[PDB]
């Protein structure tokens, strides 16, 4: 009770609900103020775990909510509310499901190309994973971070396709060593896209390697 | 970065822009809440320099914004936003221009007679001048403070006009000693106003002194 | 002087020459005693850098010298003596050459398959590189450590050669990312050995991937 199972945390959940309600109709400044009030309440509970995710939600409001992407900040606020409400009940089996959903959206964001959504998503994933004693969901996070940053670096400049292919091989081997499977179909799709791009060009002796890589990771996914 | 060049300070700037937008359409309580949120953000950056000016902006909202003077609190919030944004870039040549504009506004307010605007402008000017290592723009601030307070004291009561004249000579000599120029033509205008008041009355042997004072100070400014 | 440029350090060097002389004629216990005396002397110099490498030399005597490998512990003690004598002269351009020789010996040991020599060599390399401010010579050391441990784990058990190929690709991508080229021809030779082993077997659809790997890595080595 008294800020350990209910009361203050229930107030935070109610405020987050009002924030989502405001977001779903368009008022972004009011939702930002409500999230600031929720952060002020959380600073008086001595949790050190909900304060960070509420700050992440506030920053998500700032970035995504102000611009045209209004449905990507409501998702962050919903994840914050669900993380808090899975802590007001002392439930650990729900944090794993929340982390699974968060990781699926990080994969979706990487596949799409959203930048502002991705940072808040990985921040939430790290916060959940550091409070769950999970290390198989954090090294995948680091590998995806490196992959995304290096992909952006190569796409901004005009580097050749060989370095991008090397990126794909490196991240595929890293995830294969990890053993994660849900992060591998996205990489398979991206490798197929790169193979289609290469097939447009006349350069050879790199397409056979790419096709062999796709077949190998697909076979391992079937095994996994 | 991380609250030293951007991030938190950029959030403060964005909230200040939202507050000004709210002010230019009339919602004062929402702007007050936004400024309170900005103050809460600034309290988490450890600056000791933007927090005070944001508090001054909050008080300016309280005083001017709640009353009919909606264009004089938007000015304070704009000055706060510009001071913060001239600090997120590490620019010192812009703080001098901001101080010049603030001092011009102080002189305009003293010429008009605004009381709530005057205190906020003086607080902003002192905050800027205590961070720029300037002592020429502070002694003139003290002289104008004393001049305004004594003017209000004489005008509230029924003191004789000779005391007002002595006040005028005293402040004119003080500003001549400090060497400031932009603060002295306002004194000339006030001296002409008092001379016009004197010429209305039949009392003599004090008006020629007033004319000589105006001519001498005008000649000194021409030299200045 | 007095244990900072000469005296005690020259005593240690002379004892190291005596240790080499004993090792080259066969007396291993006497060389071990001499190295222990040198360690005792170094403990009275407060270097914190020569003591560790002398301990490494002592352990190398213990392991390699006791068995028939008498030419592999003399090399370790020689490297220790050269490291000390390159510190009695205040020379930094010689530590780089010593690190080059040590890394070349690490590569030769990995290619040959020696285990006791390898650990002493990487210990010496780590001690030298932690006193030279080099980070391009440490990540390659970590990659080679992981490669050797995983290679031994695969060779001891009855794992399939597909995981061996995955190991090869992984370490090749890591070495390409760091950019080291002198550690890559040993990997080239091991990859050709694995390709010859695969050609013995009738299994296909993995030989083409391997061959493309050698071609690509050799092309990159030419570029490097
Ligand atoms: Zn806010
Ligand atoms: Zn495979
Ligand atoms: Zn307020
Ligand atoms: Zn004069
Ligand atoms: Zn011994
Ligand atoms: Zn390549």
Interhelix angle for C139-156 vs C116-129, to 10°? 160
Contact A62 B14 (CB under 8 A): yes
Quickly tell me which residue has 């006349």 as its tokens: A202
Return phi, psi of residue A49, to 5°: -120, -35
Residue A204: CB partners within 8 Å, gap ≥ 6? Answer: none
Nearest residue on chain B to A66, alpha-carbon basis:
B14
- Measured from the Cβ of residue C72, the count of other Cβ atoms closer than 10 Å reads 20
How was this structure obtained?
Answer: cryo-EM
CA distance C187 to C169: 10
Crossing angle, helix C184-200 and helix C93-112, to 10 degrees?
A: 10
> What are the contacts of C4-11 at 24+ separation with CB within 8 A?
C5/C88, C5/C89, C5/C90, C6/C88, C8/C41, C8/C42, C8/C44, C8/C45, C9/C45, C9/C47, C9/C50, C9/C84, C9/C87, C9/C88, C10/C88, C11/C38, C11/C41
Residues with CB under 5 A from ligand 2 (ion): A 216; C 162
Angle subtended at Cα B157 by Cα B154 and Cα B159, rounded to the nearest 5 degrees: 60
**Which residues lie below 8 Å from residue C118, measured CB to CB, with a gap of 6+?**
C106, C109, C110, C148
**Closest to A19 (Cα-Cα) out of A64, A76, A83, A69:** A76
Which residue from C166, C173, C212 is facing A208, i.e. has the nearest CB? Answer: C212
Chain C: partners with 3+ C-beta pairs within 8 Å: A
Distance A217 CA to ligand 2 centre (A): 7
8 A C-beta contact, residue C14 and residue C85: no
For residues B22 and B35, the answer to whether their CB atoms sit within 8 Å is: no
Q: State the distance from the centre of ligand 3 to the C-alpha of B65, rounded, in angstroms.
A: 12
Number of neighbours of residue B84 by Cβ within 10 angstroms: 21
- C111 and C144 Cβ atoms separated by less than 8 Å: no
Ligand lying closest to the C-alpha of residue C19: 5
Q: Which among A29, A40, A62 is the nearest to B34, CB-wise?
A: A29
Three-point CA angle C175, C176, C178, nearest 5°: 65
Helix (H) or strand (E) holding C206: none
Cβ neighbour number for residue B80 with a 10 Å cutoff: 28
State whether A170 and C173 contact (CB < 8 Å).
Answer: yes
Report the distance separating Cα C209 and Cα B10, nearest Å. Answer: 51
Residues of A in contact with C213 (CB under 8 A): 209
- Chain B residue numbers with beta carbons less than 8 Å from the beta carbon of A40 are 40
* C111 CA: distance to closest CA in chain A (Å): 23
Spatial contact of A88 and A42, defined as CB atoms under 8 Å apart: no
Please, where are the H alpha helices in B73-160? 73-85, 93-112, 116-129, 136-156
Contacts of B161 (CB under 8 A, 6+ apart): B194, B197, B198, B201, B203, B206
Here the tokens at position A223 are: 């095994």
Contact (Cβ atoms closer than 8 angstroms) between residue C173 and residue A173: yes
* CB C67 within 8 Å of CB C117: no
Chains in contact with B, where contact means 3 or more Cβ–Cβ distances below 8 Å, are A
CA distances from A47 to A38, A41, A96, A142, B160 (A): 13, 11, 20, 26, 66
Please report the DSSP string for C69-115 in residue order: --TTHHHHHHHHHHHHHTTTTT-SHHHHHHHHHHHHHHHHHHHHT-S
Number of other CB atoms surrounding residue A136 within 10 Å: 10
Residue A37 — left, alpha, or beta (φ > 0 → left; ψ -120 to 50 → alpha)? alpha
CB contact under 8 A, C169 and A166: no
**For residue C48, how many other CB atoms are within 10 A of its CB?**
9
What is the distance between the alpha carbons of residues B61 and B76, in angstroms, rounded to a whole number?
8
B156: which 2 tokens? Answer: 């509230």
Mutate to test the interface with A, among C161, C172, C216, C220 (most CBs of A within 10 A): C216
Most A CBs within 10 Å: which of B15, B37, B40, B42, as the mutation test of the A interface?
A: B37
Nearest one of C183, C181, C113 to C143, comparing CA atoms: C183
Token pair, residue A78, equals 């919903």
**Dihedral sign, Cα of residue A17, residue A23, residue A24, residue A27:** positive
CB-based contacts of B88: which residues, under 8 Å, 6+ apart?
A: B5, B6, B9, B10, B13
Q: How far apart are CA B160 and CA A65, in angstroms?
A: 62
Beta-carbon neighbour count of residue A205 at 10 Å? Answer: 10
3-class DSSP assignment, residue B177:
helix
| Contact (CB<8Å) A212/C212 | yes
Smallest CA–CA distance, residue B140 to chain A, in Å, is: 40
Q: Read out DSSP for A65-79?
A: IHSS--TTHHHHHHH
Q: What is the CA angle B40-B43-B47, rounded to 5?
A: 140
Nearest CA-CA distance, residue A196 and chain B, Å: 40
| CB pairs A-B closer than 8 Å | 15
Closest partner CB to C166 (pick from A166, A173, A212): A173
* Chains B+C touching (3+ CB pairs under 8 Å): no
Testing the interface with B: which of A19, A28, A29 to mutate, by most B Cβ within 10 A? A29
Cα gap C19→A60, rounded to integer Å: 67
CA distance B140 to B119: 15
- Residues C27 and C80 sit within 8 Å (Cβ to Cβ): no
Inspect the interface and report whether the beta carbons of B33 and A33 lie closer than 8 Å: yes
Report the neighbours of A using a cutoff of 3 or more CB pairs below 8 angstroms.
B, C
Ligand 5 ion: Cβ-proximal residues, 5 Å cutoff: C 32, 36
- In 3-state terms, what secondary structure has residue B87? coil
Contact A121, A110 (CB under 8 A): no
Contact A78, A61 (CB under 8 A): no
Q: How many CA atoms lie within 13 A of B221 on its CB side?
A: 18
Residues of B within 8 A of A29 (CB-CB) are 18, 22, 30, 34
3-state secondary structure of B125: helix
Task: Give the tokens for residue B214.
Answer: 């105006």
- The token pair that represents B82 in the structure block: 């510009």
What six digits make up the tokens of A126? 């790290």
Distance between CA atoms of residues A86 and A93, nearest Å: 9
**Cα first-last separation, chain A:** 44
User: B199 in the Ramachandran plot: left (φ > 0), alpha (ψ -120 to 50) or beta?
Assistant: alpha
Q: What whole-number distance in Å separates Cα of residue C125 and Cα of residue C135?
A: 12
Which residue stretches of chain C are H helix? 8-23, 28-42, 50-60, 66, 73-85, 93-112, 116-129, 139-156, 161-178, 184-200, 207-223
Q: Which residue of C has its CA nearest to A166?
A: C173
CA dist., res. B209 & res. B165, Å (int)? 9
Q: Which one of the ligands is nearest to C66 CA?
A: 5
Q: Do residues A168 and A213 make contact, with C-beta atoms less than 8 angstroms apart?
A: yes
**Which token pair is A153?**
């670096």
CA B220 – CA B183 distance, rounded (Å)? 13
Paired tokens of A174: 């890293």
Please give the Cα distance from C57 to C13 (Å, whole number).
13
The position carrying tokens 């794992």 is C159
Residue C61 DSSP label: I
Residues at Cβ < 5 Å from ligand 6 ion: A 162; C 216
Which of A32, A51, A56 would you mutate first to test chain B, the one with the most B CBs within 10 A? A32
Q: How close is the nearest chain C Cα to the Cα of A128, in Å?
A: 30
State the distance from the centre of ligand 4 to the C-alpha of B214, rounded, in angstroms. Answer: 10
Q: Which residue of B has its CA nearest to A30?
A: B30
> How many Å lie between the centroid of ligand 4 and the Cα of residue A31?
62
Residue A202 to residue C62: CA distance in whole angstroms = 60
Q: Find tokens 């071990």 and name the residue.
A: C32
């Amino acid at each position: 009770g008294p800020g350990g199972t209910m009361e203050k945390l229930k107030e935070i959940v109610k405020h987050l609900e009002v924030a989502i309600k405001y977001l779903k109709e368009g008022k972004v400044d009011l939702a930002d103020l409500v999230v600031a009030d929720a952060i002020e309440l959380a600073k008086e509970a001595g949790d050190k775990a909900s304060l960070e995710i509420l700050k992440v939600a506030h920053k998500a409001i700032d970035t995504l909510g102000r611009e045209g992407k209004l449905e990507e900040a409501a998702k962050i606020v919903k994840y914050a509310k669900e993380y808090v409400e899975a802590k007001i009940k002392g439930d650990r089996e729900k944090l794993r499901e929340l982390l699974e959903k968060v990781k699926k959206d990080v994969l979706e964001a990487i596949k799409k190309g959203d930048e502002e959504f991705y940072e808040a998503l990985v921040k939430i994933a790290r916060i959940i994973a550091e409070d769950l004693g999970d290390e198989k969901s954090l090294k995948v996070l680091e590998a995806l971070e490196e992959f995304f940053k290096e992909w952006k670096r190569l796409e901004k400049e005009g580097k050749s396709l060989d370095e991008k292919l090397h990126l794909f091989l490196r991240v595929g081997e890293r995830l294969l060593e990890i053993g994660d499977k849900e992060s591998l179909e996205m990489l398979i799709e991206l490798l197929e896209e790169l193979a289609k791009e290469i097939k447009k060009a006349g350069n050879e002796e790199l397409l056979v390697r790419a096709e062999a890589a796709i077949k190998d990771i697909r076979k391992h996914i079937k095994e996994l």
